[PDB]
Design a binder for this molecule. Structure first.
Ligand SMILES: C[n+]1cn([C@@H]2O[C@H](COP(=O)(O)OP(=O)(O)OP(=O)(O)OC[C@H]3O[C@@H](n4cnc5c(=O)[nH]c(N)nc54)[C@H](O)[C@@H]3O)[C@@H](O)[C@H]2O)c2nc(N)[nH]c(=O)c21
Ligand SMILES: [Mg+2]
Lengths: 148, 732
């Protein structure tokens, strides 16, 4: 009944897919009813096998789509995990988000839904945009940012 | 607005203030009275809510209902009116755990001069009276006693100032009742069967023993904070009320009562020599401390960070080894049989959040507990061990797999089947699946290498065999060629038409080949199954076919358990095989050597859940469709429910028949060769049967007629029956 309802880990993030079609209203309606998650900060060598093992801890996974370099077609450092039920996705959001996957801290976000073309880095150079300007060194994402 | 502000303030008092609690209760007291004219209903609602949802705050709010009753008799009378109504509802709806918090809130009100001390006694006398009730489940007679005893830590002291006459005659009927209860369920609920170091006691016996130490101590406990203690000046002259005659609701066929429990215990004051003395196992302080901690987790389970914080800041009247209580209570929940209150992975990250909050003291205790758990492994229940493995391996992966493995060197020279070495082997296997083979070989010492997991490599039969005397060999070679060429189903069918014998040989060459050419990733094998899905549905149109697929797939991937699991799952969901076949596969002779490994059961339970989920889904659809062409559907949804439930019952039927068959075979052989019945194999097998009951007792209940009269009958060995009878005692 009261504020015990607090579920901060399940709340919508600030991210919004700029290539989505509908309003921000249509993207938000999908996000609050989604069963698919965006997973960020993976290493380029984190496998689908590892993702399956960690994310299955919160419920049965239906499909996993690895993010790829649009032009090189190699692991990009992100992925989409889709559950059969939202209750299971919420729990991944609640207890898996912010923990270690293949030795690195990952972050999950609700996703409107997979669609052909969502698996490619939108990064100017092919990988993820995030990596174009990174000013930190990351041996799991190819060293320094692209502008370096 | 205002509505909003009230709820905000009602919560503020319970929360950690920045000005003595008594002050806030003083203030909010008036504020609420001032608003009674206009906001009587809301404040009456808000309080009845915090009463059943914030037990860990029990005494902070009872006080409040007191200061108020000390400024508006008629108000208190209304609150107490709601509470009873609110309590009658929770009871009729089978929400007994919520009731206890109500029944306990009333109790403590007596200490706040709001309810007539004698009044409470009259109700409890009626609770215990349930023990006399004829032809009612023991779990029912149990709940009322528990509701009664669990209150005494709060009411008992003053409830002893009066009606000692009946407040002795109640203990009398209790004692009598407590000694007449059957305890058939204990063996099935204990985390450990060893009596040492710590006995795992039935929950009512443990509480009974707890009340005693309190009574014989003149009902003077030293933990339960009582704010209504610093307000005697006011509460004194307050006018108490009288709870109406409470007649417990009649046991109906729709009643469902909490299952009995066993108290998890792993710590004692000697486990923390240099720390505030830990309340003993039979002290009410222990009960109350774990109760509040359990309730805190229940209130914040969805937010891990808030949760750790509410735990770590727990307010204890007198200092206690908090960190130890927090770890003990979390493991108490993870290892609770039949099931934990919350999703398993929650405890893992909850513990992580606690380690980040008390970097300087929590980790050592958590490291101490891990050590202790490992050393007591020999008698831990299989279902808990699994839980232990998954927790520890997942935990390690968040701390770079850093652990002092040599501390567990003793396992190295034990039968590989013993609980300790097996536990290490399984933990390591799990660590590999969260990373990779080589990484794990690198974390453990050279001496442990033997327990490391095998490299998860594919095993092609007609592969670089060069051993071609095998049937269908060439046929397989054509398949390999076709697949790599983007062949079509019909083409593959053609290649298969050249196979000499449901055709076992066709299956084997197809599977062996299809899997080998998709052995690079899970996603390849999946699409592989999806593309040539039609072939599968053909070769395995029969149960023998279904069973043979599973047999060849296992032959191919026996070194990669995680692959086997995801494939079986995918096969069931795409109907290439069904649960019955998976069940027969699990008990097949081809798996006899891997029968006690975790992945075997992880698969069987994942198959059972898919069946259950499926049943539930169709039932709901019918439910919705029934709540409205629209007919032709309900005709169809009915048929689907039928089949779904029928196939579900059959799955449990086969699983049980198989268990009975292999357990009897063992029991007989032993009782003939005069050999020990208690072998490692037996332990896993008997405890795996028990687990079937634990995980799905709800569904299984629907088969009582068949189970009680057709399968688990008297001609069965008592060792097997025992498991059944324990199960029945859960709702007896
Ligand atoms: C980060 N993220 C990606 N996807 C999906 O994964 C694919 C990969 O494309 P990206 O190539 O990963 O795509 P974008 O995010 O489209 O663009 P962008 O939003 O601009 O933004 C931010 C990352 O780039 C950085 N960035 C962008 N522009 C600048 C700039 O001008 N300067 C600097 N310094 N940094 C910038 C910034 O720090 C930021 O965090 C796409 O299909 C996405 O839908 C996400 N999906 C969900 N649900 N939630 C997310 O949080 C999420
Ligand atoms: Mg039946």
């Amino acid at each position: 009944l009261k504020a015990l309802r607090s579920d901060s880990y399940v709340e919508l993030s600030q991210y919004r897919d700029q290539h989505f079609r509908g309003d921000n209203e249509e993207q938000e309606k999908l996000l609050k009813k989604s069963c698919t998650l965006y997973v960020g900060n993976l290493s380029f060598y984190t496998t689908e096998e590892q993702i399956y093992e960690l994310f299955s801890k919160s419920g049965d996974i239906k499909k996993i789509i690895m993010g790829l370099d649009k032009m090189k077609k190699t692991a990009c450092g992100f992925c989409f995990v889709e559950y059969y039920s939202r209750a299971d996705a919420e729990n991944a959001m609640r207890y898996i988000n912010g923990t270690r996957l293949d030795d690195r801290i990952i972050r999950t976000d609700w996703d409107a839904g997979f669609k052909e073309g969502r698996q490619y880095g939108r990064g100017r150079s092919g990988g993820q945009v995030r990596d174009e300007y990174r000013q930190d060194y990351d041996a799991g994402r190819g060293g320094y940012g692209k502008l370096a | 607005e205002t509505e909003d502000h009230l709820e905000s303030l009602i919560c503020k008092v319970g929360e950690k203030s920045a000005c003595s609690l008594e002050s806030n209760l003083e203030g909010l007291a008036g504020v609420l009275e001032a608003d009674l004219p206009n906001y009587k209903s809301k404040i009456l609602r808000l309080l009845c809510t915090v009463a059943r949802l914030l037990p860990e705050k029990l005494t902070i709010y009872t006080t409040l209902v007191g200061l108020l009753n000390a400024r508006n008799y008629n108000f208190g009378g209304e609150f107490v009116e709601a509470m009873i109504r609110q309590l009658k509802e929770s009871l009729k709806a089978n929400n007994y755990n919520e009731a206890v918090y109500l029944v306990r809130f009333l109790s403590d009100l007596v200490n706040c001069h709001v309810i007539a001390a004698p009044s409470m006694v009259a109700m409890f006398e009626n609770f215990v009276s349930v023990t006399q009730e004829e032809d009612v489940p023991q779990v029912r007679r149990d709940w009322y006693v528990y509701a009664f005893l669990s209150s005494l830590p709060w009411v008992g002291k003053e409830l002893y100032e009066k009606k000692d006459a009946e407040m002795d005659r109640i203990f009398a009927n209790t004692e009598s009742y407590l000694k007449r209860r059957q305890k058939t369920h204990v063996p099935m609920l204990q985390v450990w069967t060893a009596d040492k170091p710590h006995p795992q006691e039935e929950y009512l016996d443990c509480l009974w023993a707890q009340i005693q130490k309190l009574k014989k101590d003149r009902w003077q406990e030293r933990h339960i904070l009582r704010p209504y203690l610093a307000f005697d000046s006011i509460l004194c002259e307050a006018l108490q009320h009288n709870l109406p005659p409470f007649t417990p609701p009649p046991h109906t066929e729709d009643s469902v009562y909490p299952m009995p429990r066993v108290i998890f215990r792993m710590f004692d004051y000697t486990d923390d020599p240099e720390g505030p003395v830990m309340p003993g196992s039979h002290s009410v302080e222990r009960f109350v401390i774990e109760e509040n901690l359990h309730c805190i987790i229940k209130s914040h389970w969805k937010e891990r960070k808030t949760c750790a914080a509410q735990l770590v800041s727990y307010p204890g009247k007198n200092k206690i080894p908090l960190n130890y209580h927090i770890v003990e209570v979390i493991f108490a929940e993870l290892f609770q049989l039949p099931a934990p209150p919350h999703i398993d992975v929650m405890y893992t990250t909850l513990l992580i959040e606690l380690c980040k909050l008390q970097p300087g003291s929590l980790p050592q205790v958590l490291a101490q507990a891990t050590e202790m758990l490992y050393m007591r492994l020999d008698t831990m229940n299989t279902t808990c061990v699994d839980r232990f493995i998954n927790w520890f391996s997942h935990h390690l992966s968040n701390f770079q797999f850093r652990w002092s493995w040599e501390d567990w060197s003793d396992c190295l020279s034990q039968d590989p089947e013993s609980p300790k070495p097996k536990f290490v082997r399984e933990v390591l296997e799990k660590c590999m699946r969260l990373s990779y083979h080589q990484r794990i070989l690198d974390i453990v010492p050279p001496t442990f290498s033997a327990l490391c997991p095998a490299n998860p490599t594919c095993i092609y039969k007609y592969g670089d065999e060069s051993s071609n005397s095998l049937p269908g060999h060439s046929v397989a070679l054509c398949l390999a060629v076709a697949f790599k060429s983007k062949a079509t189903n019909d083409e593959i069918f053609s290649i298969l038409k050249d196979v000499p014998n449901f055709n076992p040989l066709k299956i084997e060459v197809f599977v062996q080949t299809l899997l080998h050419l998709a052995a690079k990733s899970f996603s390849h094998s999946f699409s592989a199954l999806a593309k040539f899905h039609e072939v599968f549905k053909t070769l395995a149109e029969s149960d023998e076919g279904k069973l043979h697929v599973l047999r060849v797939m296992f032959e191919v991937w026996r070194n990669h358990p995680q692959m086997i699991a995801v494939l079986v799952d995918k096969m069931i969901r795409t109907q290439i095989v069904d649960c019955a076949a998976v069940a027969n596969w699990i008990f097949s002779s081809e798996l006899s050597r891997d029968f006690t490994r975790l992945f075997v059961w992880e698969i069987l339970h994942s198959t059972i859940r898919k069946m259950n989920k499926h049943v539930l889904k169709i039932q709901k659809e019918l439910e919705e469709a029934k709540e409205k062409v629209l007919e032709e559907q309900i005709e169809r949804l009915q048929e689907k429910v039928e089949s779904a439930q029928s196939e579900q019952k059959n799955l449990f039927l086969v699983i049980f028949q198989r268990f009975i068959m292999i357990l009897t075979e063992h029991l007989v052989r032993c009782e003939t060769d005069g050999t020990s019945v208690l072998t490692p194999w037996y332990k896993n097998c008997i405890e795996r049967l028990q687990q079937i009951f634990l995980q799905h007792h709800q569904i299984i209940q629907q088969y009582m007629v068949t189970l009680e009269n057709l399968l688990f009958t008297a001609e069965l060995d008592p060792h097997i029956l025992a498991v059944f009878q324990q199960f029945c005692a859960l709702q007896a």
